[PDB]
Assembly symmetry: D2
Homo-oligomer: 169 residues x 4
Amino acid sequence: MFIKPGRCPKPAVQEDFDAARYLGVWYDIQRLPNKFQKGECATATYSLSPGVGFSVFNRERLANGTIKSVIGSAIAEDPCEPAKLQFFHENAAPVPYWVLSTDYDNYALVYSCINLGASHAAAASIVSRQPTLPEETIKKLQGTMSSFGVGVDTLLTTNQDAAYCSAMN
Amino acid sequence: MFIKPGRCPKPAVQEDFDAARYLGVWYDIQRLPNKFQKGECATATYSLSPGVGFSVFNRERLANGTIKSVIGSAIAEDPCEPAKLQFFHENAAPVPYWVLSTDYDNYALVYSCINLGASHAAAASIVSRQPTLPEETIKKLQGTMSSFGVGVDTLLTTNQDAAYCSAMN
Amino acid sequence: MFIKPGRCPKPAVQEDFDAARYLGVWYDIQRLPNKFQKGECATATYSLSPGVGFSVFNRERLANGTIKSVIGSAIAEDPCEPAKLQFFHENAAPVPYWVLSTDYDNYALVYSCINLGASHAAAASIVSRQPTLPEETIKKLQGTMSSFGVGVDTLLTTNQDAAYCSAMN
Amino acid sequence: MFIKPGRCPKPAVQEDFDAARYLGVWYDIQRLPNKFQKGECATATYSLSPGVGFSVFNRERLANGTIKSVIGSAIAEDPCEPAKLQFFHENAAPVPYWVLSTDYDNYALVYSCINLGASHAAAASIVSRQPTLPEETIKKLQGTMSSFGVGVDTLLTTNQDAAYCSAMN
Ligand SMILES: C=CC1=C(C)/C(=C/c2[nH]c(/C=C3N=C(/C=C4\NC(=O)C(C)=C4C=C)C(C)=C\3CCC(=O)O)c(CCC(=O)O)c2C)NC1=O
Ligand SMILES: C=CC1=C(C)/C(=C/c2[nH]c(/C=C3N=C(/C=C4\NC(=O)C(C)=C4C=C)C(C)=C\3CCC(=O)O)c(CCC(=O)O)c2C)NC1=O
Ligand SMILES: C=CC1=C(C)/C(=C/c2[nH]c(/C=C3N=C(/C=C4\NC(=O)C(C)=C4C=C)C(C)=C\3CCC(=O)O)c(CCC(=O)O)c2C)NC1=O
Ligand SMILES: C=CC1=C(C)/C(=C/c2[nH]c(/C=C3N=C(/C=C4\NC(=O)C(C)=C4C=C)C(C)=C\3CCC(=O)O)c(CCC(=O)O)c2C)NC1=O
């Protein structure tokens, strides 16, 4: 199920979020079941933007070996709340993007929730600067999610095997 | 599935919508699969409000014979667009309510869609001032929906049988 | 003036706000300069609503003795933040209404800010269950506003002299 | 003044708007009174963005010869309405930006309105690819604004005299 009961949670975000250090490539390690990622080998590339915010380039290897991509823009509409962002993708409506925790150098936890009456629809990914994350960090970012309701048993481990994700090199 | 592909449509609404005549009791005849209606015998009661807009009282007979109810408030945030309303229910986030077509005296078609990136989540009900609607009107309000994408084959015919909905009298 | 430099602040609101004990009649003691109050002797009557939230009745005397009034509906769009309400006045667009402090029985502090780029337009009023309030309360509620950037030297003391306000039976 | 009575209009926008042909340098010819332009010789440079939308560079001369500038990002939040854009300027909150008419090669009409209860605050500018525009074009774009309530007698002609604007290499 993608519509989970209950309204959107209001989890804590990363304090003094430095977007400049958050830039670069991030590998999807574990993700909540979503409908936008239709393949595996997912990567998020955050690069510089001429105006405000940063740019977004997302890539995945579909099962047919085809690499699908989406471009987008990221802005924190409240500059005093830099970790709560709004992501504007192509052919898409504005979606929320909240950095809950990151070291900028190894791990990152991201959350998106849109309210639907008394139900909600959420997106979550555990990302790494490498195609793998230590199990300790995964178990700790999984506890941050369990703390505000997420069934960390619904999490899907994204395939990042070097031989399968070879077209993404 | 409750998350359908594609963004929210922008269908046409009832012209010169008179909310005063739309007040009263409406019976659910056919509805898109939703998560808020967990029973049958659904009824919508729109009554007067002391300030702006009108009040909302929704009732259904659950399978245990229990009548569940929800109260709410309805406001058209744009007075020059009176058919595009916002419904504020209890323990719920603000949801959209658009009257697409009504005679005020027999039939009414309602639509709610919230965007979720490149996907959407929608609610739809064909309502009648009586527990039944003629099949001609159902087939015509079903064509208005087919015209903007709705799979009118996903529609659920709400049970309004007099003997089963007897606790709602 | 009315459009002041700087984005809107996000002040703290009253905790465990009870809109039921907030119901009744509030008299304007002091107000930030605004464009909707074109008179004095102002009163805000918060009443009950059949649906969600409370009803609004705002009354004031103009310099020509005429009593002008407005009706509106008040709704907390997030039930988990019931002190951050939205006010839907007649012939008017949705405007914010935040109860920052209230003892329900004597005083209340209210703030409204809409963002206008790098500037803002704000409304704030100190209210009482009586046509007067003690200087100690006025001075502490002024210190709360001062903490978030409000020039308390721009505030205007509303006229609540029973002789001037005699048309308010 | 700046806060004018009445809610915001919903004017018509340019059809099949091409943001690519809209890119480049636009000079301010005439403008509605606003609080962000504190000088003259104004220019808006619309450039390319690595993600969604275009970049913004707004430049003006102050009475003291200093050239003040702002950077921002422009995004059409609804891809099916690309002429209704949102502008995210630096140190500023999201503000609306609507291209109502443009031939891309000579003229453009732009409007912004945020609602302030039963009042409103609006921004509008007539732009040219040259520091001047023909009276026939100015007069037709004034008639478009006049159709939706804009007092064209409040408009201000921006100074684009090459001698005064000499600091703009
Ligand atoms: C409910 C919230 C919600 C979010 C957050 C969201 C994001 C989002 N991700 C997308 C694609 C994508 N998103 C990713 C990857 C990621 N995306 C991430 O949020 C992160 C951190 C990764 C992980 C690396 C990839 C690889 C694509 C491209 C998929 C494709 O083109 O097939 C798109 C493009 C539209 C689409 O193809 O469906 C959107 C809007 N959509 C939503 O509905
Ligand atoms: C995606 C949009 C969307 C809408 C529109 C929506 C409406 C909505 N309908 C509700 C209940 C209800 N709604 C109805 C009935 C109706 N409801 C109607 O929209 C109409 C026209 C009928 C038909 C008569 C009933 C009977 C209940 C009470 C269900 C219960 O309490 O068990 C509630 C209360 C919260 C809940 O119990 O889930 C909401 C928010 N929720 C959404 O997520
Ligand atoms: C930027 C935010 C903002 C707010 C909050 C706002 C409220 C607001 N107050 C109004 C009327 C009014 N408002 C009040 C009274 C009050 N108002 C209060 O919120 C309180 C506490 C009092 C004081 C007791 C009165 C008396 C009127 C009617 C004035 C008249 O009709 O002459 C109206 C009706 C529109 C109008 O008459 O112009 C609005 C929208 N307007 C805005 O632009
Ligand atoms: C209510 C709506 C609204 C809008 C649209 C708006 C735009 C806007 N224009 C700005 C700067 C600016 N705006 C412009 C120029 C232009 N601006 C234009 O949209 C166009 C067409 C020109 C003219 C060519 C310039 C030159 C500056 C910088 C002024 C300076 O720094 O002194 C800023 C930065 C904040 C500031 O410097 O105060 C904003 C938010 N602000 C608002 O409040």
